[PDB]
Amino acid sequence: ENQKLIANQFNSAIGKIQDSLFSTPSALGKLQDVVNHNAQALNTLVKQLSSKFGAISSVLNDILSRLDPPEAEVQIDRLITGRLQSLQTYVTQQLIRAAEIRASANLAATKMSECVLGQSKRVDFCGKGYHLMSFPQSAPHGVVFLHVTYVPAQEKNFTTAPAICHDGKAHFPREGVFVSNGTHWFLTQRNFYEPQIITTDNTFVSGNCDVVIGIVNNTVYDPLQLELDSFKE
């Protein structure tokens, strides 16, 4: 019944996504930080070659040309130790960052499978709100999910009751909630206000009129009894 409105809202949200991405520069901050960390690691690794590590110089040719092989050996050994420590530190940092990226990629694959390939009921897993569907988008060294969520709005207050008692029996809602606009009682959905006439087809009988705490007295219309009263003199 509200197909055009929901379609227009979806189109407007998709249009606003481009504005929120084109204007805000910190949208791709995670991917940018990954790239910057890799670049800084490479730059530090290549700049560690200029360090002497206690040696006379960082150039192997200068050490070989200035000093005799006996002490040139220990100078080259110090340089080798320093550069090997640098390489080991780089490899350890790369292993840690690779474990972090593996965790992130496992999370991304789980979210893909549970939001794009299906509908997930996990709260705050496929976006903020009641998840409808998600759309993946390819990104450099990453992925972007467009989570379409259902957000309720324009809430009103209605007097509620846990059950109703009509003929000494307690009637409970099958799907919905008993609400009151002040004078009359109706049955409606929990996530959308759609007042329906409380009938036997919408409720079920359980217990008596005295067991439920907070039960109210309201009529329960029976379509079968009403149709029988029509075919009667």
Least separation in angstroms between CB 211 and a copy of itself: 5
Q: Which of 71, 73, 100, 201 binds other proteins (CB under 8 A)?
A: 100
The letter for the amino acid at 139 is A
- Does 139 bind a copy of itself (CB under 8 A)? Our answer is no
Kindly tell me which of 89 and 218 has the beta carbon lying closer to other proteins. 89
- Does 191 bind a copy of itself (CB under 8 A)? Our answer is no
- Does 224 bind other proteins (CB under 8 A)? Our answer is no
Q: Which of 63, 164, 212, 220 binds a copy of itself (CB under 8 A)?
A: 212
Tokens of 77: 């050994």
Nearest to 160 by CA among 142, 180, 175: 180
Least separation in angstroms between CB 35 and other proteins: 15
Kindly tell me which of 68 and 151 has the beta carbon lying closer to other proteins. 151
Least separation in angstroms between CB 200 and a copy of itself: 9
Tokens of 23: 């204007």
Binding partner of residue 224 among other proteins, a copy of itself, none, CB cut-off 5 to 8 Å per kind = a copy of itself
Q: Does residue 30 contact residue 142 with C-beta atoms inside 8 Å?
A: yes
Tokens of 220: 């329960």
- Does 206 bind a copy of itself (CB under 8 A)? Our answer is yes
Residue 228: is it exposed, middle or buried by C-beta count within 10 angstroms (0-12/13-18/19+)? exposed
φ and ψ of 187, to 5 deg: -115, 135
Kindly tell me which of 104 and 199 has the beta carbon lying closer to a copy of itself. 199
Least separation in angstroms between CB 3 and a copy of itself: 6
Kindly tell me which of 26 and 191 has the beta carbon lying closer to a copy of itself. 191
| CA 12/CA 95 separation, integer angstroms | 43
| CA 169/CA 211 separation, integer angstroms | 10
- What DSSP character marks residue 40? H
φ and ψ of 217, to 5 deg: -95, 115
Binding site for a copy of itself (CB under 8 A): 1, 3, 194, 206-207, 211-213, 223-224, 227-228, 231-232
